[PDB]
Design a protein around this ligand. Structure first.
Ligand SMILES: *[B]([O])([O])[C]([N]C(=O)[C]C1=[C][C]=[C]S1)C1=[C]C(C([O])=O)=[C][C]=[C]1
Length: 354
């Protein structure tokens, strides 16, 4: 359709001037047809354009891949979401963390895990020691606190269950099964020329730094085509291997609610159609930064939509999809813009189409 380009230009393009963003890639998939819109530069200093080879950091959108990896492991019988991490990380047995189940970790309800590890935690030993000393605060399962260490520990345990380091689970099993050609935990030499610079608030060129359990929490890099294939698989998984179909399905099941937000595995779920403010509320300070007491799902929505924002210091991402409309959108920038702007522009676009 000849209006998709026009709508993306009206709603996403103004954001480059407004936030002084060097480079953007916006993708729409509708009725199994992909549209790729590219703006500006992957590297300011090299005068290099954004294109279908441009590799961006996904930030917390990496969590969706962690969730899928976990779904895949559940369905090959390598793990159960009622398990505890001590069953795979031997050294955590019988510590208080070994009362938390894998689901509770993946969905941020351990009752005492913060957004980030302390700056001081860096090596594997410091990570191990962090979880050994862990003690509860809220009743386990009762409180959602959005957390890198929580899902990161899930990710490490999933990898353990598959006897392979986490980067190899994604690069050798999960990415290939999704048909992705250029998605990485570690960007190889051969593709470094395609890796965008990110840009901080002082417009300095930056890329993500090493950190503890970074890969499963925020550590994947991808292109617009690949992310459009990931959305397709989410929208239309029948074409994909059975294994990966079951994984995908697992990531769509809502597990509990926080007001109008349903927490699935990695993805955030809403009743469709969702009001704009519903979508904005999921990225509110109250939801992202503060603990919130969860409830069981009462209303099981009949028609669902799903989203997830992601950031690193130099990059913004947003991904959204609506199965009932066979439509989805992906936005990638090499500078952060406010989450509310990403959400609102996608809302206007996806409603305008149908
Ligand atoms: B995620 O939800 O995108 C997550 N990102 C990270 O923790 C990785 C980063 C390190 C430094 C800056 S981001 C995250 C993102 C945000 C946000 O609004 O950008 C807030 C909390 C966690």
């Amino acid at each position: 359709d000849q209006e998709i380009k026009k709508l993306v230009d009206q709603n996403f393009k103004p954001l480059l001037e407004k936030y002084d963003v060097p480079g953007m890639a916006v993708g729409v998939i509708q009725n199994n047809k992909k549209y790729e819109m590219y703006y500006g530069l992957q590297s300011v200093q090299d005068k290099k354009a954004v294109n279908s080879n441009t590799i961006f950091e996904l930030g917390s959108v990496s969590k969706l891949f962690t969730a899928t990896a976990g779904g895949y492991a559940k369905n090959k019988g390598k793990i159960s979401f009622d398990d505890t991490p001590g069953k795979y990380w031997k050294e955590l047995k019988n510590t208080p963390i070994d009362q938390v189940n894998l689901l509770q970790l993946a969905t941020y309800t351990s009752g005492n895990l913060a957004l980030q590890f302390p700056d001081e935690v860096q090596t594997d030993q410091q990570v191990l020691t962090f979880f050994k000393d862990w003690k509860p605060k809220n009743p386990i399962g009762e409180y959602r606190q959005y957390s890198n260490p929580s899902i990161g520990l899930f990710g490490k345990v999933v990898a353990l269950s598959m006897n392979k380091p986490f980067d190899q689970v994604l690069e050798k099993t999960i990415f290939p099964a999704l048909g992705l050609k250029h998605s990485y935990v570690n960007v190889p030499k051969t593709q470094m020329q395609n890796y965008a610079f990110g840009y901080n608030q002082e417009n300095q060129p930056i890329r993500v730094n090493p950190g503890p359990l970074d890969a499963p929490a925020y550590g994947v890099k991808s292109t617009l085509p690949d992310m459009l294939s990931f959305i397709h698989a989410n929208l239309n998984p029948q074409k994909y291997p059975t294994d990966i179909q079951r994984a995908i399905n697992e990531t769509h099941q809502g597990r509990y609610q926080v007001n109008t937000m349903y927490q699935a595995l990695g993805w955030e779920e809403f009743s469709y159609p969702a009001t704009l403010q519903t979508l904005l509320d999921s990225n509110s300070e109250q939801i992202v930064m503060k603990p919130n007491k969860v409830t069981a799902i009462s209303k099981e929505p009949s028609v669902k939509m799903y989203h997830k924002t992601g950031s690193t210091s130099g990059f913004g991402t947003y991904v959204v999809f609506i199965p009932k409309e066979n439509i989805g959108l992906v936005m990638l920038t090499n500078k952060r813009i406010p989450n509310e702007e990403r959400i609102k522009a996608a809302y206007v676009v996806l409603n305008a189409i149908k």
